[PDB]
C-alpha cells in the first residue's frame, strides 16, 4: 500500500470522535512527493517540452502555431503563477489518472494541471495571448471547467471530438434507420454519447409497402442500435453508451419499456442502450382524470395527416386521433403506465422522463421545432428537424441533429471571486470556439445543426458544496433563493455574451427571427419579475457583484432585439461526472449522495470527503437520499426557470419508499415545471 | 410453530451466484502457491459432491416422507437451493479461476477419492433406506442430513473462510458465506423435524436413537479426519481444520437436541473473521399539489 | 443441448406472491354476478387442486427418474415453483376474494366433482405407474405432465384471462399470468425430455407411443368438453373456451414433437388481450488419393 | 382431413407388398376437383382477368403494354394448349401454395400454372410474341425453370427482386462496415440472400489509428450483420438469411468458427448468419505435411504490402508473410483446424467450404479479381472488387459486388425433348433479360457489377431423376459419363448464346479482353479432349442430338474470339429447393435424400415420392446417405469441370461415420477439383 493511500484511509480513523479530514491534504502532498513528481517528465525548458509533444504526435501544430513561443511561455507562466494545489487526494488522482497527458507506454506523466490548463486556454483563445491568459486565470482559479471531452482532448492530436452529447432524429424508413445506426457508430467512435429519437418510427405490426403486420417496431431498431453501440466502444476503452427516446403515446411504449425489465428475454432486452420516455401533458391529464388513454400507430397518423405523431401537439391532436377511424390505436391505462414507469425506475433507474410541455412552454425555438427528446444525460433540450436519408445516388434532405457544447461553472469558485459575469462570458466564448472548431464529416445533420444553431451548454456545479460551506441547507428556501438569483445572473450574462458575439460577428443563429428572443417574449418574466435575493444572507453572499434588475433586463432585451443572439441555446446543466473531482466540487447542481465516498481502485481503497466537509458543516452536507425529494424538485425547478435547456435531475430514493412515492415525485416535478428527470438511484 | 417463519426466511434468502462478479478474485488466486490452489479446488469439489446429493436425493426424499404442504414447500425450496444454486455456484468459481483441464481433473478426483466416496455412500445409503410410514428410518436419514448440513460441509468451508478472513478470494468467499448462511438454517430446520420424531419414542427407543446418532457421528468423524489430513497437510492446516470440524459437530448435535460431544477449543481467529420494489396504486390525490 | 438455456430462463422468471397486492380486486369482484363469482371460484379451485398434484408428485417423480445432474436441478427448481410460489399464490387469491367458510365449501364441491376428478386421477395414475429404469413408463408420465402443463390448465386459465383482458380482477389476473408463464416453460421443458426418450425408440415402438399420446389426448379432451360445459354454460362462454382448449392441445402436442391434432382456430380477442459425431484424428495418408 | 390428403396418404398403405404410387395421381385430381378449381377465380375472358390483375396492383402494366391483347391471348392459348397436368399432388400443392398468385386476403387463387408461365414468358420476351411463345413452350414442357424469385415475382406489382443471391465485399473500415450492414438490410428487404466477405476486416486485437488491441474482429461485424438480417426478414414472412465468409488464414478463423459452436456464449453465438470458410491450397498443403500453420492479422499485411491478405495469392505469399517481422501472425495447427471444421459440420452443417485454388485455377476472370468467397448457397463463384465507401460528403469508390440470376434446366425434360441447345439458349436469353431489367437503387456495387459483369447462373435439376428413370446408378461411371457429356453440351451452347448476344448487341462484359475467353485458354480442354459419351447406353440417351466435338469447340472458340462473350459467368448450379417440387424433379444435381419424403403441412402429413419412383426403379433411386460420398464427389467434379461458377454440393453423411470420414471427404473433394461444399447433412 502506497503512503498517500494510507494517509487517505487515515481519514476514516476517528480522532477525538472526529474524522481526520486534514489528513487528506497530507495525502495529496505524498501523492505528489512520492508518485506524481517521480513519474512526471521534465524538460530543460518549455520550448523543448512543446517540441517533444508536437513531434511525438501528442499535440496539434495548428493551435500552437497561432502564437509566438513568447506568448505560449507567458500563458504557461500565468498558469504556474497561481501555484495551484489540489486540496484533496482524489482531485489530483482523478486528474492524473483521467486527464493528464501520458506517454504512449502510459508510465510517465507529460502534462501537469497547469500544462493542461495552459494548452486548453491556448486552444480556446485561437491566437489571442491576452484571451489565453484570461482563460488560464479562469481555469486555474477553477471558476470554469470545460467538459471532459474538451478538457481532455483540447490541443491533442490523438483525440476524439470535443462534443460528446449527440441527439439524432430517426425517420420512419429502412434507409434512415441504417443511416442512424451508421451515425451512432461514427459518433461513438468519436467518443460521444448518442441519443436517438424513435418516436417517428412506426410501431410493431404496421404496414411496409401495404403489406400488413410487417414492421418489427422500435424494439428491433433498439436491438440494432444496441449492437451498434456495443461494437463502437471507443476502440475498446469505454463501454459504448447510447440512449433511445420514445413518446409515451407511441404504441411500442410498453415493449420499449419491456426492454429494461429483468424478466425480458435475450431477444427483447437491450443492455447498453439507455431508454427515455417523452411524456406530453396530455398523458398526465389522462392519468390524472383516470380516463383510459390510447397509444397510436405512428404510420397511420402519418398517412392520415402527412406529419409524424411526435411532430404535432398531442394536446390538440389526441381527440382527433382517437375520433379518426383511419388512425389505429390501442387502449391503455395511463395510471398503469405511470406505475410501470415508477417500477422500472425503481428496478433499474430507467426510463428517463421528459415532460414535453414543460420543455416546450418555455422553449425559445418552437418555430424551428418543438423539443421532442433529450440526450443520454437528459439535460439537452433543443429543436431538432428529422432528416430524409434517401437511397443511394439520391440527394438526402439534411435536417438538424442536436449536438451542444458542454462546460460547467464552479459556483463556489465563481461566487467567492465575485466574477459571475466574467466567468459566464469567458465560458460562453470558449464554448463558441469549441462549437465552431467542431467538424464531423460522418454526421451530416449534426454538422449542419452545429453550424446553424450554434448551440452551447453552459452548466454549473458545486451548488451543494457552495451552500454547505456557507451554512445553507440544500432544501432551505434560502438555497432556492440563491439558486434563483445566481442562475438568473448566469442567464443574463449568457444572453448578453450571445448578443455581443452576434453583434461582433454580424450573424445570429439560423431562424433566430422566429425565436422568442427576437420577439422579446423570452424576457417577459425578466422585465416584470425581480430576481434579487429575498433573504439578507443571500444578498450578503452576492455582495460585491451587480445583480441585474428589471431595468437591466429591459436593456438586455432591447440589445437582443437590435443585435440578435448568436447561440440558439446557451445553458444546460450536465451531470459533470469526473471533472467535479478535479475541480474539488460536488457533481452538478445535485445534492451530494454521500458525505465521504469509498472507492476501490485496483486492489486499494480510497476515501473522498465532499469538498470543504468538516465538523462545522457536516450537518449542512446532508446526503441526497436523506433529503425530501419535493424540495430537491423545488430547487431544480427554481434553477430550471433560468436555464433554456434542461438539467440532469437524478432522483435519490430510499429502499423504503414505493412506486407511489416515485410517481408522486415525478408528478410534482411535472407540476413544478421540471423538464427532465434523469435517474432514480435507490440507496 | 416454526415452518412459516422458516418458509419466510428461506425465500427471503434467495440468491444466484451470477449476482456476485468473480473476476475480482483473479489476482489473489494467481498469487497462491500450487499446493494452496490444489487444496482449494479439491475442497470446493468435495462440497459440490455433497450438495449434488443433498439436492438430487436427500432433500427431495425427506420432502416426500414429511407430512404437510407447508413443510414440503420449505423442504422443496431447500432442495432447489442445494442443486440449482449451491452446487452450481462452485462451477461458477471453477470456471473463473481454473482452466478446463484442471476442472476436469478435480471432478475425476472426486470419483476416485476414497473418503469422499465413503461419506457419500454412508449418507445416501441412509436416505435411500427410508421406508414409507416408518418414522425411525426417516429419523435416521434426518440425522444423516443434519450431519451433512452442520458437520460434513465444514472441512470444506474452512478454507474459503480462512482466505476471506485474510482479505483474499473475497468474491468466491462471499458466495461461500451465502451458502453457509443457507446450510445453517437447513441444519436447524431438519434438526427440528428429527426432534419431533425422537420425542414420540419410548425412553428405551430414545436411548437406541442416541446410540445410532453418536455411532454415526463417530464413524463420519473418523473418516473426515483422514479426508482433512489428505487435503490440508500440504498447506499445513490439518490440526486447525480438525478443531473447526469438532466445533461444528457439536452444533450438529445441538441441532438434534443432544449435548455437545467434543471439548471446546480455540478456533483460528482468521476463520472467525471469515464469518423489485413495493408497489402502490396511484390515488387521485397524488395528481394534485 | 437445452438444459442450461432452460435453467437460465427458469431462474430469471423467479417471483413471489407478496409482489402483487391483491386487495384492490375487491373493487371489481363486488360487481360480478353470482354465476360469474361461482365459475371463478370453481375454476380457481380446479387449478389449485391440479397444481398441488404437480408439486407433490408430478415434478418430483420426474426429477427422481431422469438422469443428469443439471436436469435434476432444473426439475427441482420447477417443483419448488409449484409448491413454494404457485400454491401460496392460489391460496392468497382465495383468501382475498372469499371468506373461510366459502373457500372450504368450494373445495368440498370441486373435490367431489366428476370431471375434475376424472382428469386429476388419470394424470396421477400415470405418475404412479412409473417404474425404476423403465424409460417407456417415464415417457408416458412425461406426456401426462405436458398435457397438464400445456393443455389441462387452460380450460381454467381462460376465465382469469377473460377478466384480465376486460380490466376486471387485474391483481389476481397478473398473478395467474405469471403462473401460466411458468407452466408454459414447464410444459416445453418436460416435452423436450419426452422427445429424447421417444427418439431412442424403434419405429414400431414410436408408432405405439404416438398411439398412446393421441389416445390419452382424446380421453382428456372429451372430459374437458364436459368439464367446460359444466362450468361455463352458466356464463355463456363454452363455445369460445372449447376453441381455447383445442389451440392449447395443439401446443402440448408440438411440445412433444407431434403434429397438431385440431384445425387452426382464432381465439377470443378479450382472452388474447389478457394473454456430436465421434472426433477421430487425421492419421495422414488421408491427404493422398 | 381432405380427400386428396387421404389419397396421398394411401401411397404408403402397401397393396400386395408394393407402394400405391398411382394413388398419388388420384390425389392431384382430387386436389384440383375439390380445392383448386373451386378456389380459382374465373373471368369471362382473358381481357377481364388481365384488367382486374392490372388495376388491382397485382401485375405491372408496363410489361403487358408491350403486347397487343391478341398477342397475349395467343401466348395464353399456347400455354393452355399443352394441357399440362401435375403428375404428383405435391407439385401442384407447392405451386399453388408458394408460387400461384392469390388475392390480397389470400382466400382465392388468381393464377393457374399456365397463367403464371404465360406471365413469366411475356415478361421474358419483352414485346416479342414469338419469343413469348417459345418461353411458354419451354416452361410448360418444364424444360427450363426460372428461379423462385423470378418465377414467383415476374410481372408482379407487389414483387420483390428477381435476383436470388447477392455477394458483398466488406472493406476494413467503419464506414464500409456500416454500408455493408445497410446494403444487407436493403437486399434482405428485397428478399435476396446476402453473402459478405469478412476476410478484409482486420482481426481482433488490431489497431484503429495507433491505439492497439482495439478492434472487435470479424465477430463484432458478424453480430451486427446477424442483427441486421434478423431485423430485415422479408417483412416477417421468410427469416432473413445471411452468409459470412472468412479466409482460413484470417486470425479470427477460430472465433469465426466459434460462432457456430453449440456451446458458444450469447455474446459470440450467431444464429441467423451462415458461415463459410475459404481454404486456399496452401492450408491443405500445410495440413497434409503436418507443419504448423500461421493465421495472419489482415491490417498488418495491408500496412506492409498495401494490399489485403485475401487480395493476393497465399500460395506464393505465405512464406513472405511468415518471414516478415512487420506482419503479425498466430501459430495454429492446420490439422486441428481441419478437425474443428469437420466437427462443426457434423454438429451444425457449418461452415461452407470454398477451395479457393480449385475455384481460381479454372476461373476465367482472374484478371478482374480472384474469387475470394461464395454466396449463401456456396455455388456462386465470381470476381469481386471491394468498394471504398468513404465519409459523408466524399465520393465513394464503387467496386463490384457479385449478383447473378438463377435458372435451372430440367435434365429429364430437356433430354426427353432432345433440346439441350434450344433450352440452353432460351434460358440464357431469359437470364440476360432478368439481369437487364434488374436495377437495385440501394446497392451501388451490386448495380455496377450487374451492369458490367452481366453474370447469370444457369443451373440444372433432375439429374438423379433422369438417371434413375433411365436405369443408371447415380454412382456408376455411366452416370458420370452422362453428366460429362450433358454439361459439356450445356457449356457449349451457353458460350454460343453468350457470344451470339455479344455479337447482336455489339458489347461484351466489362474487362472481357483480359479473360481466358478472349485469350482462348478457356477452350483448351475443349479443343483437345473429346467429351462424347464413352458408353453405348449414354450415347443412345444422347441420340437425336448433335454432341459437340473438338471441331465444334474450335469453331466456338473462333466465334468467341471474333465477337466476345456477353456474360462473364453463365452456369451455376443452385440447390433449387422448393421449385423442384413444381417441376417434378429431384433437387439440383444432388442425389435424392429419401425416396418418399414425409412432410407435415398444417395438421396434416403428406408423402412425396421421388419423380418417377416405382418398383422397377426403386433401387436406382438410391438415397444419398446410403451412397459413397467419394463417388458423389466424382460426379460433382465431373459436372464442375463444365461449370464456370460453383455447384451447391451438400454432403450426405451417416451418424456412424466420424469427423475423420468428413475430413477425408473434404480432402478428396479438394483433390478432385471441387470448388465449394455446401452442407454436411447427417442422417
Ligand atoms: N497539494 C498539491 N497539489 C499540487 N501539487 C502539489 C501539491 N503538493 C505538492 N505538489 C507539487 O510538489 C511540489 C513540492 O511542493 P512542496 O509542498 O514541497 O513545496 P513548494 O514550496 O510548493 O515547492 P516548489 O519549490 O516545488 O514550488 C510543488 O511545487 C508541486 O509541483
Ligand atoms: N393433375 C392436374 N394438373 C393440373 N390441372 C388439373 C389436374 N387434374 C385436374 N386438373 C384441372 O381440373 C380439370 C378437371 O378436368 P379433368 O382433368 O378431370 O378432365 P376433363 O373434365 O375430361 O377435361 P380435361 O382433362 O380435358 O381438362 C381439368 O380440366 C384441369 O383444369
Ligand atoms: C470504429 C471501430 C472500428 N473497428 C475496426 C473495424 C474496422 O474494420 C477497422 C477499421 O476502422 P476505420 O473506420 O478504418 O477506423 P480509422 O480509419 O479511423 O482507423 P485506420 O486509419 O487505422 O483505418 O476498425 C472496431 O472494431 N470497432 C470500432 O468501434
Ligand atoms: Mg418509407
Ligand atoms: Mg480506415
Ligand atoms: Mn447446500
Ligand atoms: Mn443444505
Ligand atoms: Mn404450478
Ligand atoms: Mn408447472
PDB file of C-alpha atoms in Angstrom, chain B residues 92-277:
ATOM      1  CA  UNK B  92     -19.017 -20.528 -11.446  1.00  0.00           C
ATOM      2  CA  UNK B  93     -15.989 -20.298  -9.162  1.00  0.00           C
ATOM      3  CA  UNK B  94     -14.137 -23.102 -11.039  1.00  0.00           C
ATOM      4  CA  UNK B  95     -14.883 -21.584 -14.467  1.00  0.00           C
ATOM      5  CA  UNK B  96     -13.483 -18.218 -13.390  1.00  0.00           C
ATOM      6  CA  UNK B  97     -10.286 -19.363 -11.659  1.00  0.00           C
ATOM      7  CA  UNK B  98      -9.252 -22.588 -13.386  1.00  0.00           C
ATOM      8  CA  UNK B  99      -8.577 -23.874 -16.910  1.00  0.00           C
ATOM      9  CA  UNK B 100     -10.855 -26.648 -18.217  1.00  0.00           C
ATOM     10  CA  UNK B 101      -8.250 -29.425 -17.728  1.00  0.00           C
ATOM     11  CA  UNK B 102      -7.836 -28.614 -14.036  1.00  0.00           C
ATOM     12  CA  UNK B 103     -11.632 -28.565 -13.694  1.00  0.00           C
ATOM     13  CA  UNK B 104     -11.911 -31.962 -15.482  1.00  0.00           C
ATOM     14  CA  UNK B 105      -9.151 -33.414 -13.267  1.00  0.00           C
ATOM     15  CA  UNK B 106     -10.769 -32.311  -9.978  1.00  0.00           C
ATOM     16  CA  UNK B 107     -14.126 -33.879 -10.921  1.00  0.00           C
ATOM     17  CA  UNK B 108     -12.267 -37.090 -11.825  1.00  0.00           C
ATOM     18  CA  UNK B 109     -10.548 -36.808  -8.431  1.00  0.00           C
ATOM     19  CA  UNK B 110     -13.886 -36.748  -6.538  1.00  0.00           C
ATOM     20  CA  UNK B 111     -14.923 -40.035  -8.234  1.00  0.00           C
ATOM     21  CA  UNK B 112     -11.781 -41.874  -7.063  1.00  0.00           C
ATOM     22  CA  UNK B 113     -11.235 -40.283  -3.628  1.00  0.00           C
ATOM     23  CA  UNK B 114     -11.997 -42.961  -1.012  1.00  0.00           C
ATOM     24  CA  UNK B 115     -13.063 -40.643   1.849  1.00  0.00           C
ATOM     25  CA  UNK B 116     -15.446 -38.659  -0.333  1.00  0.00           C
ATOM     26  CA  UNK B 117     -16.921 -41.889  -1.758  1.00  0.00           C
ATOM     27  CA  UNK B 118     -17.266 -43.371   1.744  1.00  0.00           C
ATOM     28  CA  UNK B 119     -19.099 -40.313   3.121  1.00  0.00           C
ATOM     29  CA  UNK B 120     -21.454 -40.196   0.111  1.00  0.00           C
ATOM     30  CA  UNK B 121     -22.073 -43.963   0.409  1.00  0.00           C
ATOM     31  CA  UNK B 122     -22.996 -43.609   4.071  1.00  0.00           C
ATOM     32  CA  UNK B 123     -25.200 -40.543   3.789  1.00  0.00           C
ATOM     33  CA  UNK B 124     -27.026 -41.535   0.572  1.00  0.00           C
ATOM     34  CA  UNK B 125     -27.448 -45.085   1.873  1.00  0.00           C
ATOM     35  CA  UNK B 126     -29.419 -43.766   4.815  1.00  0.00           C
ATOM     36  CA  UNK B 127     -31.558 -41.540   2.513  1.00  0.00           C
ATOM     37  CA  UNK B 128     -32.402 -44.499   0.323  1.00  0.00           C
ATOM     38  CA  UNK B 129     -33.224 -46.702   3.309  1.00  0.00           C
ATOM     39  CA  UNK B 130     -36.235 -44.529   4.289  1.00  0.00           C
ATOM     40  CA  UNK B 131     -39.405 -46.633   4.317  1.00  0.00           C
ATOM     41  CA  UNK B 132     -42.835 -45.086   3.786  1.00  0.00           C
ATOM     42  CA  UNK B 133     -44.727 -44.573   7.064  1.00  0.00           C
ATOM     43  CA  UNK B 134     -41.661 -45.691   9.028  1.00  0.00           C
ATOM     44  CA  UNK B 135     -40.657 -42.780  11.221  1.00  0.00           C
ATOM     45  CA  UNK B 136     -37.490 -44.457  12.555  1.00  0.00           C
ATOM     46  CA  UNK B 137     -35.899 -44.842   9.107  1.00  0.00           C
ATOM     47  CA  UNK B 138     -36.886 -41.218   8.440  1.00  0.00           C
ATOM     48  CA  UNK B 139     -35.253 -40.038  11.720  1.00  0.00           C
ATOM     49  CA  UNK B 140     -32.030 -41.833  10.773  1.00  0.00           C
ATOM     50  CA  UNK B 141     -31.940 -40.079   7.385  1.00  0.00           C
ATOM     51  CA  UNK B 142     -32.664 -36.688   9.061  1.00  0.00           C
ATOM     52  CA  UNK B 143     -29.731 -37.258  11.425  1.00  0.00           C
ATOM     53  CA  UNK B 144     -27.580 -38.009   8.367  1.00  0.00           C
ATOM     54  CA  UNK B 145     -28.862 -34.800   6.701  1.00  0.00           C
ATOM     55  CA  UNK B 146     -28.140 -32.674   9.798  1.00  0.00           C
ATOM     56  CA  UNK B 147     -24.621 -34.209   9.898  1.00  0.00           C
ATOM     57  CA  UNK B 148     -24.162 -33.278   6.222  1.00  0.00           C
ATOM     58  CA  UNK B 149     -25.519 -29.712   6.729  1.00  0.00           C
ATOM     59  CA  UNK B 150     -23.914 -28.797  10.040  1.00  0.00           C
ATOM     60  CA  UNK B 151     -20.802 -31.001  10.282  1.00  0.00           C
ATOM     61  CA  UNK B 152     -19.563 -32.512   6.954  1.00  0.00           C
ATOM     62  CA  UNK B 153     -19.548 -29.276   4.914  1.00  0.00           C
ATOM     63  CA  UNK B 154     -17.178 -27.664   7.392  1.00  0.00           C
ATOM     64  CA  UNK B 155     -13.911 -29.397   6.448  1.00  0.00           C
ATOM     65  CA  UNK B 156     -14.617 -27.721   3.085  1.00  0.00           C
ATOM     66  CA  UNK B 157     -15.906 -24.328   4.320  1.00  0.00           C
ATOM     67  CA  UNK B 158     -12.770 -23.801   6.450  1.00  0.00           C
ATOM     68  CA  UNK B 159     -10.510 -22.845   3.560  1.00  0.00           C
ATOM     69  CA  UNK B 160     -12.655 -20.224   1.733  1.00  0.00           C
ATOM     70  CA  UNK B 161     -13.357 -18.684   5.166  1.00  0.00           C
ATOM     71  CA  UNK B 162      -9.648 -18.782   6.047  1.00  0.00           C
ATOM     72  CA  UNK B 163      -8.863 -16.777   2.890  1.00  0.00           C
ATOM     73  CA  UNK B 164     -11.852 -14.399   3.220  1.00  0.00           C
ATOM     74  CA  UNK B 165     -10.618 -13.555   6.721  1.00  0.00           C
ATOM     75  CA  UNK B 166      -7.216 -12.501   5.299  1.00  0.00           C
ATOM     76  CA  UNK B 167      -8.818 -10.390   2.565  1.00  0.00           C
ATOM     77  CA  UNK B 168      -8.123 -12.987  -0.118  1.00  0.00           C
ATOM     78  CA  UNK B 169     -10.521 -14.542  -2.652  1.00  0.00           C
ATOM     79  CA  UNK B 170     -13.271 -12.356  -1.286  1.00  0.00           C
ATOM     80  CA  UNK B 171     -15.784 -12.726  -4.133  1.00  0.00           C
ATOM     81  CA  UNK B 172     -15.648 -16.554  -4.007  1.00  0.00           C
ATOM     82  CA  UNK B 173     -15.740 -16.090  -0.220  1.00  0.00           C
ATOM     83  CA  UNK B 174     -18.933 -14.041  -0.489  1.00  0.00           C
ATOM     84  CA  UNK B 175     -20.586 -16.933  -2.379  1.00  0.00           C
ATOM     85  CA  UNK B 176     -19.405 -19.416   0.262  1.00  0.00           C
ATOM     86  CA  UNK B 177     -20.786 -17.239   3.104  1.00  0.00           C
ATOM     87  CA  UNK B 178     -24.175 -17.189   1.381  1.00  0.00           C
ATOM     88  CA  UNK B 179     -24.056 -20.997   1.022  1.00  0.00           C
ATOM     89  CA  UNK B 180     -23.057 -21.287   4.712  1.00  0.00           C
ATOM     90  CA  UNK B 181     -25.865 -18.952   5.810  1.00  0.00           C
ATOM     91  CA  UNK B 182     -28.327 -21.283   3.956  1.00  0.00           C
ATOM     92  CA  UNK B 183     -26.880 -24.531   5.401  1.00  0.00           C
ATOM     93  CA  UNK B 184     -27.088 -23.176   8.955  1.00  0.00           C
ATOM     94  CA  UNK B 185     -30.881 -22.690   8.647  1.00  0.00           C
ATOM     95  CA  UNK B 186     -31.257 -26.003   6.731  1.00  0.00           C
ATOM     96  CA  UNK B 187     -29.499 -27.855   9.592  1.00  0.00           C
ATOM     97  CA  UNK B 188     -31.699 -26.194  12.229  1.00  0.00           C
ATOM     98  CA  UNK B 189     -34.920 -26.948  10.323  1.00  0.00           C
ATOM     99  CA  UNK B 190     -34.136 -30.624   9.629  1.00  0.00           C
ATOM    100  CA  UNK B 191     -32.926 -30.878  13.254  1.00  0.00           C
ATOM    101  CA  UNK B 192     -36.336 -29.719  14.500  1.00  0.00           C
ATOM    102  CA  UNK B 193     -38.100 -32.348  12.336  1.00  0.00           C
ATOM    103  CA  UNK B 194     -35.770 -35.061  13.675  1.00  0.00           C
ATOM    104  CA  UNK B 195     -36.525 -33.984  17.274  1.00  0.00           C
ATOM    105  CA  UNK B 196     -40.252 -34.297  16.546  1.00  0.00           C
ATOM    106  CA  UNK B 197     -39.783 -37.977  15.688  1.00  0.00           C
ATOM    107  CA  UNK B 198     -37.359 -38.650  18.557  1.00  0.00           C
ATOM    108  CA  UNK B 199     -39.805 -37.107  21.056  1.00  0.00           C
ATOM    109  CA  UNK B 200     -42.507 -39.635  20.082  1.00  0.00           C
ATOM    110  CA  UNK B 201     -40.398 -42.589  21.244  1.00  0.00           C
ATOM    111  CA  UNK B 202     -40.216 -44.578  24.499  1.00  0.00           C
ATOM    112  CA  UNK B 203     -37.190 -43.919  26.731  1.00  0.00           C
ATOM    113  CA  UNK B 204     -35.712 -47.254  25.602  1.00  0.00           C
ATOM    114  CA  UNK B 205     -36.128 -46.330  21.923  1.00  0.00           C
ATOM    115  CA  UNK B 206     -34.651 -42.855  22.546  1.00  0.00           C
ATOM    116  CA  UNK B 207     -31.584 -44.474  24.118  1.00  0.00           C
ATOM    117  CA  UNK B 208     -31.116 -46.533  20.925  1.00  0.00           C
ATOM    118  CA  UNK B 209     -31.570 -43.456  18.702  1.00  0.00           C
ATOM    119  CA  UNK B 210     -28.876 -41.558  20.658  1.00  0.00           C
ATOM    120  CA  UNK B 211     -26.601 -44.587  20.171  1.00  0.00           C
ATOM    121  CA  UNK B 212     -27.337 -44.509  16.431  1.00  0.00           C
ATOM    122  CA  UNK B 213     -26.635 -40.752  16.244  1.00  0.00           C
ATOM    123  CA  UNK B 214     -23.389 -40.917  18.232  1.00  0.00           C
ATOM    124  CA  UNK B 215     -22.108 -44.058  16.441  1.00  0.00           C
ATOM    125  CA  UNK B 216     -22.858 -42.427  13.084  1.00  0.00           C
ATOM    126  CA  UNK B 217     -21.189 -39.181  14.117  1.00  0.00           C
ATOM    127  CA  UNK B 218     -18.031 -41.009  15.270  1.00  0.00           C
ATOM    128  CA  UNK B 219     -17.887 -43.063  12.068  1.00  0.00           C
ATOM    129  CA  UNK B 220     -18.268 -39.935   9.906  1.00  0.00           C
ATOM    130  CA  UNK B 221     -15.810 -38.060  12.144  1.00  0.00           C
ATOM    131  CA  UNK B 222     -13.050 -40.699  11.793  1.00  0.00           C
ATOM    132  CA  UNK B 223     -13.443 -40.639   8.009  1.00  0.00           C
ATOM    133  CA  UNK B 224     -13.442 -36.810   7.985  1.00  0.00           C
ATOM    134  CA  UNK B 225     -10.137 -36.772   9.924  1.00  0.00           C
ATOM    135  CA  UNK B 226      -8.447 -38.809   7.183  1.00  0.00           C
ATOM    136  CA  UNK B 227     -10.054 -36.614   4.477  1.00  0.00           C
ATOM    137  CA  UNK B 228      -8.886 -33.475   6.305  1.00  0.00           C
ATOM    138  CA  UNK B 229      -5.291 -34.729   6.597  1.00  0.00           C
ATOM    139  CA  UNK B 230      -5.285 -35.770   2.961  1.00  0.00           C
ATOM    140  CA  UNK B 231      -6.321 -32.260   1.829  1.00  0.00           C
ATOM    141  CA  UNK B 232      -4.708 -29.949   4.366  1.00  0.00           C
ATOM    142  CA  UNK B 233      -1.297 -31.470   5.214  1.00  0.00           C
ATOM    143  CA  UNK B 234       0.144 -29.894   2.028  1.00  0.00           C
ATOM    144  CA  UNK B 235      -0.934 -26.404   3.247  1.00  0.00           C
ATOM    145  CA  UNK B 236      -0.063 -27.009   6.924  1.00  0.00           C
ATOM    146  CA  UNK B 237      -3.574 -26.589   8.326  1.00  0.00           C
ATOM    147  CA  UNK B 238      -4.866 -30.060   9.226  1.00  0.00           C
ATOM    148  CA  UNK B 239      -4.834 -29.600  13.020  1.00  0.00           C
ATOM    149  CA  UNK B 240      -6.642 -26.248  12.750  1.00  0.00           C
ATOM    150  CA  UNK B 241      -9.352 -27.680  10.458  1.00  0.00           C
ATOM    151  CA  UNK B 242      -9.827 -30.628  12.844  1.00  0.00           C
ATOM    152  CA  UNK B 243     -10.624 -28.209  15.673  1.00  0.00           C
ATOM    153  CA  UNK B 244     -13.151 -26.487  13.370  1.00  0.00           C
ATOM    154  CA  UNK B 245     -14.966 -29.718  12.417  1.00  0.00           C
ATOM    155  CA  UNK B 246     -15.237 -30.735  16.100  1.00  0.00           C
ATOM    156  CA  UNK B 247     -16.733 -27.308  16.871  1.00  0.00           C
ATOM    157  CA  UNK B 248     -19.316 -27.831  14.127  1.00  0.00           C
ATOM    158  CA  UNK B 249     -20.016 -31.457  15.144  1.00  0.00           C
ATOM    159  CA  UNK B 250     -21.217 -30.014  18.483  1.00  0.00           C
ATOM    160  CA  UNK B 251     -23.520 -27.615  16.598  1.00  0.00           C
ATOM    161  CA  UNK B 252     -24.948 -30.557  14.619  1.00  0.00           C
ATOM    162  CA  UNK B 253     -25.612 -32.464  17.866  1.00  0.00           C
ATOM    163  CA  UNK B 254     -27.276 -29.367  19.309  1.00  0.00           C
ATOM    164  CA  UNK B 255     -29.476 -29.046  16.188  1.00  0.00           C
ATOM    165  CA  UNK B 256     -30.623 -32.600  17.066  1.00  0.00           C
ATOM    166  CA  UNK B 257     -31.325 -31.683  20.722  1.00  0.00           C
ATOM    167  CA  UNK B 258     -28.266 -33.526  22.058  1.00  0.00           C
ATOM    168  CA  UNK B 259     -25.437 -32.395  24.370  1.00  0.00           C
ATOM    169  CA  UNK B 260     -22.037 -31.382  22.859  1.00  0.00           C
ATOM    170  CA  UNK B 261     -19.638 -34.351  22.434  1.00  0.00           C
ATOM    171  CA  UNK B 262     -16.244 -32.694  21.894  1.00  0.00           C
ATOM    172  CA  UNK B 263     -14.432 -30.339  24.282  1.00  0.00           C
ATOM    173  CA  UNK B 264     -14.186 -26.639  23.347  1.00  0.00           C
ATOM    174  CA  UNK B 265     -11.010 -25.425  21.571  1.00  0.00           C
ATOM    175  CA  UNK B 266      -9.689 -22.090  20.232  1.00  0.00           C
ATOM    176  CA  UNK B 267     -10.528 -21.751  16.514  1.00  0.00           C
ATOM    177  CA  UNK B 268      -8.197 -19.783  14.201  1.00  0.00           C
ATOM    178  CA  UNK B 269      -9.295 -16.117  14.616  1.00  0.00           C
ATOM    179  CA  UNK B 270      -8.765 -15.632  10.857  1.00  0.00           C
ATOM    180  CA  UNK B 271     -11.616 -18.098  10.189  1.00  0.00           C
ATOM    181  CA  UNK B 272     -13.774 -16.243  12.764  1.00  0.00           C
ATOM    182  CA  UNK B 273     -13.136 -13.021  10.837  1.00  0.00           C
ATOM    183  CA  UNK B 274     -14.141 -15.020   7.733  1.00  0.00           C
ATOM    184  CA  UNK B 275     -17.641 -15.222   9.253  1.00  0.00           C
ATOM    185  CA  UNK B 276     -38.353  -5.390  -7.217  1.00  0.00           C
ATOM    186  CA  UNK B 277     -39.814  -2.575  -5.115  1.00  0.00           C
TER     187      UNK B 277
END
